[PDB]
Design a protein around this motif. Sequence first.
Motif, PDB file in Angstrom:
ATOM      1  N   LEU A 157     -46.136 105.746 -12.462  1.00  0.00           N
ATOM      2  CA  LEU A 157     -46.660 104.792 -12.049  1.00  0.00           C
ATOM      3  C   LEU A 157     -47.814 104.796 -11.134  1.00  0.00           C
ATOM      4  N   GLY A 158     -47.901 105.943 -10.249  1.00  0.00           N
ATOM      5  CA  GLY A 158     -49.128 106.192  -9.279  1.00  0.00           C
ATOM      6  C   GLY A 158     -50.135 106.942 -10.034  1.00  0.00           C
ATOM      7  N   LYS A 159     -50.072 107.618 -10.963  1.00  0.00           N
ATOM      8  CA  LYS A 159     -50.718 108.490 -11.815  1.00  0.00           C
ATOM      9  C   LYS A 159     -51.646 107.350 -12.300  1.00  0.00           C
ATOM     10  N   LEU A 160     -51.070 106.228 -12.630  1.00  0.00           N
ATOM     11  CA  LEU A 160     -51.725 105.030 -13.287  1.00  0.00           C
ATOM     12  C   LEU A 160     -52.229 104.390 -11.993  1.00  0.00           C
ATOM     13  N   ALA A 161     -51.947 104.315 -10.792  1.00  0.00           N
ATOM     14  CA  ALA A 161     -52.449 103.767  -9.723  1.00  0.00           C
ATOM     15  C   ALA A 161     -53.932 104.508  -9.566  1.00  0.00           C
ATOM     16  N   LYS A 162     -53.872 105.690 -10.083  1.00  0.00           N
ATOM     17  CA  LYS A 162     -54.982 106.526  -9.806  1.00  0.00           C
ATOM     18  C   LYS A 162     -56.137 105.882 -10.983  1.00  0.00           C
ATOM     19  N   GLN A 163     -55.572 105.730 -12.349  1.00  0.00           N
ATOM     20  CA  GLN A 163     -56.414 105.209 -13.303  1.00  0.00           C
ATOM     21  C   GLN A 163     -57.113 103.835 -12.803  1.00  0.00           C
ATOM     22  N   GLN A 164     -56.568 103.208 -11.836  1.00  0.00           N
ATOM     23  CA  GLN A 164     -57.081 102.173 -11.182  1.00  0.00           C
ATOM     24  C   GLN A 164     -58.240 102.407 -10.283  1.00  0.00           C
ATOM     25  N   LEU A 165     -57.815 103.244  -9.364  1.00  0.00           N
ATOM     26  CA  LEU A 165     -58.608 103.709  -8.309  1.00  0.00           C
ATOM     27  C   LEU A 165     -59.986 104.487  -9.031  1.00  0.00           C
TER      28      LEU A 165
END
Length: 24
Positions: A13-21
């Motif tokens: 989920l967060g690893k994704l939040a990073k893709q967002q960042l």
Amino acid sequence: IWLTALKFLGKNLGKLAKQQLAKL
């Protein structure tokens, strides 16, 4: 281990939040 998976998925989920960042 559903609540656990949520952590991994959260990792996912967060690893994704990073893709967002990164893009941001």
